[PDB]
Every structure is written in structure tokens, then in C-alpha cells.
Motif scaffolding. Structure first.
Motif, PDB file in Angstrom:
ATOM      1  N   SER A  76      -3.985 -15.512  25.562  1.00  0.00           N
ATOM      2  CA  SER A  76      -4.973 -15.215  26.599  1.00  0.00           C
ATOM      3  C   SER A  76      -5.367 -16.454  27.413  1.00  0.00           C
ATOM      4  CB  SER A  76      -6.206 -14.499  26.013  1.00  0.00           C
ATOM      5  OG  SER A  76      -6.496 -14.925  24.690  1.00  0.00           O
ATOM      6  N   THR A  77      -5.331 -16.309  28.741  1.00  0.00           N
ATOM      7  CA  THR A  77      -5.808 -17.332  29.678  1.00  0.00           C
ATOM      8  C   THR A  77      -7.308 -17.566  29.478  1.00  0.00           C
ATOM      9  N   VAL A  78      -8.054 -16.474  29.303  1.00  0.00           N
ATOM     10  CA  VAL A  78      -9.456 -16.533  28.896  1.00  0.00           C
ATOM     11  C   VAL A  78      -9.553 -17.131  27.494  1.00  0.00           C
ATOM     12  N   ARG A 111     -10.134 -17.937  23.832  1.00  0.00           N
ATOM     13  CA  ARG A 111     -10.151 -17.044  22.684  1.00  0.00           C
ATOM     14  C   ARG A 111     -10.158 -17.844  21.386  1.00  0.00           C
ATOM     15  NH1 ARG A 111      -6.208 -14.106  19.606  1.00  0.00           N
ATOM     16  NH2 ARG A 111      -7.181 -12.211  18.745  1.00  0.00           N
TER      17      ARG A 111
END
Ligand code: ANP
Ligand code: ANP
Ligand code: MN
Ligand code: MN
Ligand code: MN
Ligand code: MN
Lengths: 307, 307
Positions: free
Chosen positions: A181-183, A185
Motif C-alpha cells: 500500500s502507498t498509504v 500501513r
């Protein structure tokens, strides 16, 4: 003790015995993917000690899951034994919305799912089965082995049975759940406090975790992973993880060896690994800016990076 | 072939397996006599070859009949085998209002009965069980081993399973059904045309049938018969028969001998019998000027006369 668990055991036992009497052809027909079997039991002033007095058990697409079990190298009699000889145990990691159990012999995972998950499983089941045929069952995708609906006194629950990613013998000391995930995590500070914590993408990058597998194993793995994730992207599925378990042969002391026909996801470390390790890696949880096509690339980029 | 028969086999198999998991106490409780277990099965686009797609199976008072089976010297696993290993066969003698089957190993009779018969069985079941306890299972009364309700697509039928009066090995060449009725009772000319005809009170008196048993066997038999029929009279039951089967050892050629623990109703002829015979005699059909008290005396008078 748990009556929903007792109904599951009773129903799996019933389901396999019924199928033991069916002529199994080499092929499925379209109707097999719409089939089910239902049993409704009502005991009046009888057998109060073993079972709920009133329960229902429904098996979805019995012929399809029987076909899948054989394709995944699983014998029906063995599967029955694993789930009925003694009770499944509840287990540590979860995400309630969801209860997990492991079969007593640690071969299978039993996950409680929603009716919407059941509906999605039906939606993809034919394409899933066709994908399994095409790859001869050689895949990192979850292995769906049975799906059921249980009713006990007002409570309805849906259950899916899958293969444990981890070994049924070799214990795992470290566990990662990776998305790419780019976001940001990460496991929380309360999460890391768990005994066998489910670490994530940040914990892996942070603690400089390495996986020491040779070049051939890595290429084989990534090639499989590539086809699997594209299939998933094609179905518009996302939010799936690579589950990574690490067995430390040193900490554990068959002396560090595994049966590849049972622990199908096992990969031995290479000869120059700082420590004698066995890895267990597979895709889990497929049933739900960030779109499937992008998610697919992100996931593959990250995993190839960490190997 | 016969779907009602297949449901019976499936249900008996189910019933015995369920009980195999129950703790069986030495005693019954009052509620056991009001108990039942129900199963309703619905198969959609599945298993069409083996079973009806939709059926119900109900077992009445499972604990009572399990208790009775053991009291009558019958092991549950054996009973299950006799009724499920291969299909019961339809048989010659009957009286439709009623279909008879014999288990494949010839140990048990399966009779189709009415809902009113079922209601009467429930009415007398406790007193019957108590009578069986009191005599230690040594009785000429029918042995009630199981009672069931089957549903297949609109058709509901009730079934009772009893012990065959006749041997499961030694074949019977002659068969009588006796009441001791003051009113003339004879097989018709169309009846005698049957292969193994059910002869009656007149045929026996007419053809001067004799039963050659020694004095001790006769006294033992009649003493039992006396207590049994008084019990029946006490319950206001009537229209029951003494079923008499004759095995001719000469015509048949264990060389003329029987297992008394299986063929419980067998009585060898005495040493001066004109022919080597084995008799099989027991009461059948108890569930329905001529009143029970009188019927009781008439029946006993006649039977003592013919021995
Ligand atoms: N096949 C498997 N073998 C071993 N462990 C598993 C398996 N599937 C799930 N688990 C464990 O259970 C945890 C949760 O699995 P998952 O199926 O993602 O649950 P979920 O409730 O769908 N989580 P979420 O991603 O929040 O929706 C994982 O991190 C693993 O620790
Ligand atoms: N326990 C048994 N063992 C062997 N044969 C039996 C048994 N019970 C019944 N039969 C056979 O089946 C015939 C009919 O039995 P029965 O239970 O009297 O049927 P029914 O339909 O109730 N007859 P009815 O007296 O007209 O009401 C008998 O004459 C026997 O030939
Ligand atoms: Mn997940
Ligand atoms: Mn999930
Ligand atoms: Mn009769
Ligand atoms: Mn009758």
C-alpha cells in the motif's frame, strides 16, 4: 461446548459421508455451480447432550468443492478427519466485523464470513475453478475447500474452509501481512504487544526483514504470484494480502524439513542464509484512487522488492 | 429403486449412527416416551441418483426403541447392517388397507402402518416396555424394534420394524395364522393357490395338522402365551394371531439345527415326530359379542387344543 462449532463438525461429517456414496465424474456441469444441500434437524426431548435440539446445515455447491479438494491434493476422508476427530480451536489473529478457527491437526483454517461474501464467492466460483484447472492447482491463491451456512437458535453464520498457509508441523515465530500500500500501513503499538503479532508493510521495511531464498525459487514464486494477482485484478478483486510466515529451525531445537505435499507453501532458505529458515507464503483474503488494476501493480512491485 | 425404501435405509442408518454417540443409561425417563427426532433434507441440483431430492425422516421415541433392541438381544450395529447393507425385499403375505418387506438377511420384518396405529403404539408403549422388563424379554409378543415416519414428495408413510417370527436360515414350507375364532375362519380357494399360503383356523382343523413338541416345551410355551395374551386383554387389544411356521428338515436336504439366540421362536419336534420338524410360533398383529376378555379366552383355548 460451542454449539455452532458442533453443528459445523456434524455437518462436515454428514456432507462427506453423503458424497462418499456419489459417483464423482471428472467434470462439473453448469448446474453444479448453483447446487446446494440442506439439512434441518429437530430433536424433541432427545440427545440434548451432544447437539443443539434444533439446527440447520447447508452446503453450497458440494460437487464443486469436492472437485476442488481433490485438485488441491486433499482426500475427502482425510478432510473429514481433520475437521471432525476433535474440535477446531479458536485462534489469535482476526478482524471482527469475523472469528477464525484452526482444525485440530492445524491443516485447515475456518473463517466466518458474511452473506455478501457468500454471494461474491458464488459470483466468482466458476472462474476460480477454471483458473485452478488451468494452473493444475499450482497457485498462491487461497484454496477454497468448503462453504457452509449454519443455523442454531436464531443465529445464522456462514463459514468458509481454506488451507492453512503455515505448516501443520513446523511452528512459525514471525508473521507478516503485506499489501504494498502507498498509504502508510503499520501494526499499532498495541498490536505488536500480541504474542504472534500480524506485522505489516511498515514493520517489514522498518525492521529490515529479509527473506533468503535462492534465485530459482524466487523466480518460480514471482511468476506464480504474477498470474494469480492478474486473475484477481481481472475479477476486480482487491484488499488481499501476502501472508508470510517464518519458521526458525534453530529456535525449534524430520529435523527442520517439511512434507511439500502437506505444507504446500513452504520454501527452504538458501545455503548462505544467516539462519536456517523455512518460509510460508501465500495470498489470503480475496473476497472484497486505489483501483484493482493499480492495486495489482502496487502489490507485485512491493513483493518483488522484498524478495 | 423404491424411493420410500431408500429413505428408510438412509434414515435407519442416520438414526443408529446418531445414537452411537449418545450415552445410553440403564433407564428410560418419562420424556423418552414422548421424544422424537426429525430430519428434513432438501437437495437442489445435487445427488439426484441416490436419493429423492426432498424427503423427511422422523424417528419416534429413539431411546425407547434403542432400549428395547438391546433387551431383545439385538446389537445396534447389527440392526443397522441388516436394514442398510442391501435393500429390504417386498414379500408374499399381506393385507392392504399395508405393504411388507423383509430385511435382506431375513432377520426383520418391516410393516407399513397407519397414523392411527402409530397413535395406538404411543398409547401402549410404556406399558409394553414395562411388560418386556418384567418378563426379561422372554415373551411371544411382537418385538417392536423401531417406528418411523417417511415423507417423499406428497407421500407420507409410517413404518414399524419387528422381529421375523421365522428363522433367518431355516426355510419354512407351511404357515398358519390362528385366532381361535368362534366365527368360521378359513383361507379362500384363491388363497390356497398362493405359493406359501397363509392358512387359518379351519385349514388347521381340516387337514388335521399336528405339532409334535414334548411336554416340557408345550408347558413352557403355553405358560408364556397365557401371560402375554392376558397383558393384551388388559390393554383391550384384540384381532391378534398366533403365527405358526413349519420347517421340514427332510425337504431342506448346521444340518436342521438353528441358533436359538437369532431364531428365538424356534422349537424342535420331539423324538417320535413322524417327521423331523422345527416350529416357529409367536404372536403377531396386536395394534387394533366379541370383546377383548372373551377373545383372550377363545384364543388360549384353541391354541392349547392344537398342541
Ligand atoms: N489461510 C490462512 N492460514 C493461516 N493464517 C491465516 C489464513 N487466513 C487468515 N489467517 C490469519 O488471520 C488473519 C486475518 O485474515 P483475513 O482473512 O485477512 O481476515 P479478515 O477478517 O478478512 N481481515 P481484513 O483484511 O481486515 O478484512 C491473518 O493476518 C492471518 O494471521
Ligand atoms: N413378525 C412376522 N414374521 C414373519 N411373518 C410375518 C410377521 N408379521 C406378519 N407376517 C406375515 O404377514 C401376514 C400379515 O401380517 P399382519 O401383521 O396380520 O398384517 P395385517 O395387514 O395387519 N393383517 P389383518 O389381520 O388382516 O389386519 C402374516 O400372515 C404373515 O404371513
Ligand atoms: Mn485481510
Ligand atoms: Mn477481509
Ligand atoms: Mn393379522
Ligand atoms: Mn392387522
Amino acid at each position: 461446548s460451542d454449539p455452532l462449532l458442533s453443528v459445523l463438525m456434524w455437518g462436515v461429517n454428514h456432507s462427506i459421508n453423503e458424497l462418499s456414496h456419489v459417483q464423482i465424474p471428472v467434470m462439473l456441469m453448469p448446474d453444479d455451480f448453483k447446487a446446494y444441500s440442506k439439512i434441518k434437524v429437530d430433536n424433541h426431548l432427545f440427545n440434548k447432550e451432544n447437539m443443539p435440539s434444533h439446527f440447520k446445515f447447508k452446503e453450497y455447491c458440494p460437487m464443486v468443492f469436492r472437485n476442488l479438494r481433490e485438485r488441491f491434493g486433499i482426500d475427502d476422508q482425510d478432510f473429514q478427519n481433520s475437521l471432525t476427530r476433535s474440535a477446531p480451536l479458536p485462534n489469535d489473529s482476526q478482524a471482527r466485523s469475523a472469528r477464525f478457527h484452526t482444525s485440530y491437526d492445524k491443516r485447515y483454517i475456518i473463517k466466518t464470513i458474511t452473506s455478501e461474501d457468500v454471494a461474491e464467492m458464488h459470483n466468482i466460483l466458476k472462474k476460480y475453478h477454471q483458473y485452478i484447472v488451468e494452473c493444475h492447482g499450482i497457485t498462491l491463491l487461497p484454496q477454497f475447500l468448503g462453504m457452509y451456512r449454519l443455523n442454531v437458535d436464531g443465529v445464522e453464520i456462514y463459514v468458509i474452509v481454506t488451507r492453512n498457509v503455515f505448516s501443520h508441523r513446523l511452528s512459525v515465530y514471525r508473521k507478516y501481512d503485506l499489501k504494498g500500500s502507498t498509504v502508510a500501513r503499520e501494526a499499532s503499538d498495541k498490536e505488536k504487544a500480541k504474542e504472534l503479532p500480524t506485522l505489516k508493510d511498515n514493520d517489514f521495511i522498518n525492521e529490515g526483514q529479509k527473506i533468503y531464498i535462492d534465485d530459482n525459487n524466487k523466480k518460480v514464486f514471482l511468476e506464480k504470484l504474477k498470474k494469480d494477482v492478474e486473475f484477481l485484478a481481472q475479477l476486480k478483486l482487491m484488499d488481499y494480502s501476502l501472508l508470510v510466515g517464518i519458521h526458525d529451525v534453530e529456535r525449534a531445537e524430520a529435523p527442520g524439513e517439511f512434507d511439500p505435499n502437506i505444507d504446500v507453501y513452504g520454501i527452504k532458505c538458501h545455503e548462505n542464509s544467516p539462519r536456517k529458515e523455512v518460509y510460508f507464503m501465500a495470498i489470503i483474503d480475496i473476497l472484497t484512487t486505489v483501483n484493482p488494476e493499480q492495486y495489482s501493480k502496487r502489490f507485485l512491485d512491493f513483493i518483488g522488492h522484498i524478495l
